[PDB]
């Protein structure tokens, strides 16, 4: 079997991608973000706090004639943004692209933090990690890959995201017509329940290549691109004005400057993520002065190839026995 979903960004800066998921029988379908950072399939739900609701599309279970309490199964999770949530568990059919999973954790949120409540446009988030970062409790359960893999014609899925435009999630297959060149793979550690890989090095513009190994998690589910202090300081140093705001939270740069490109090392090959993309516009409604799309990790513990860097690739998450990660330019 194979799926193929568009995924959508949910406003002009493209701070994160929804992904239509259908849900139960008859289908509810959501709107959910598909988050390789983490494991856990949880939706706004008929059970969330009803003041905890702002415009979401919510799951109701009881509608479901598909729909079954995973008796005593509760979740928790919290984000590496700060943001949380919790619930209790159904199982129930779910259907991504046309790929249907029978049986899916279907994680309903009892509760969830301010900023989930604040954002209308994500019903949930699919996780796309590696089980092992379920937070189903007493008993762990597998994420909507993890249950599909077995019955895909290969053992993988891809993201194609789109720059100010929707792109692609696909299950099962690689869209040889979706990139240029050739993708080229590379190791993954699966020790931390990341899809965890060492870029080779990085560069800034047109200027010099800097073979260096940087190990960072592909991570659809994080807006930016977070790097070593080192080299986000070598990138803002391009930029006239670009500086780092204690009180804004990160690098910021005037509105008016044209940003370099960066490119990335996978292997011998190269990424690059134009200047463009590097741009998340005011810090706050009709100020001159813009969030930049590269920010320094040393406050994370981890590097983050999140949507900034993403989105500049076709991206395969190859969940074979061993697995890897590919990237080709597009």
Do not use: M
């Not at 849900?23 to 939706?43: E, M």
């Not at 994080?222 to 300081?233: E, F, I, M």
């Not at 993403?310 to 061993?322: H, Q």
Request: negative net charge.
């Amino acid at each position: 079997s194979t799926g193929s979903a568009t995924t959508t960004p949910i406003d002009s800066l493209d701070d994160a991608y929804i992904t239509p998921v259908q849900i139960g029988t008859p289908a509810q379908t959501l709107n959910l973000d598909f988050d390789t950072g983490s494991s856990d399939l949880w939706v706004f739900s008929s059970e969330t706090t009803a003041s905890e609701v702002d415009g979401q599309t919510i799951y109701t279970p009881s509608k479901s004639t598909t729909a079954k309490l995973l008796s005593g199964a509760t979740w928790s999770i919290s984000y590496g943004d700060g943001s949380s949530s919790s619930g209790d568990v159904y199982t129930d059919t779910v259907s991504v692209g046309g790929l249907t999973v029978t049986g899916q954790a279907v994680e309903s949120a009892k509760k969830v933090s301010s900023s989930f409540t604040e954002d209308s446009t994500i019903d949930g988030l699919l996780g796309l990690a590696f089980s092992t970062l379920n937070t189903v409790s007493p008993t762990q359960q597998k994420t909507f890959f993890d249950n599909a893999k077995a019955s895909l014609d290969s053992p993988v899925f891809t993201a194609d995201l789109g720059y100010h435009a929707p792109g692609t999630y696909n299950f099962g297959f690689i869209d040889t017509t979706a990139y240029t060149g050739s993708i080229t793979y590379t190791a993954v550690s699966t020790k931390q329940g990341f899809w965890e890989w060492t870029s080779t090095g990085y560069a800034v513009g047109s200027g010099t290549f800097k073979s260096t190994s940087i190990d960072g998690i592909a991570d659809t589910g994080t807006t930016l691109l977070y790097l070593p202090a080192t080299v986000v300081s070598a990138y803002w140093a391009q930029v006239s004005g670009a500086k780092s705001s204690s009180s804004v939270g990160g690098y910021v740069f005037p509105c008016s400057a044209t940003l370099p490109s960066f490119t990335f090392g996978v292997g011998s090959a190269r990424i690059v993520i134009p200047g463009d993309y590097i741009d998340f516009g005011p810090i706050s409604t009709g100020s001159s002065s813009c969030f930049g799309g590269i920010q320094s990790s040393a406050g994370i513990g981890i590097n983050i190839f999140g949507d900034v860097a993403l989105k500049a690739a076709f991206v395969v998450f190859n969940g074979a026995t061993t697995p890897t990660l590919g990237f080709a330019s597009k």
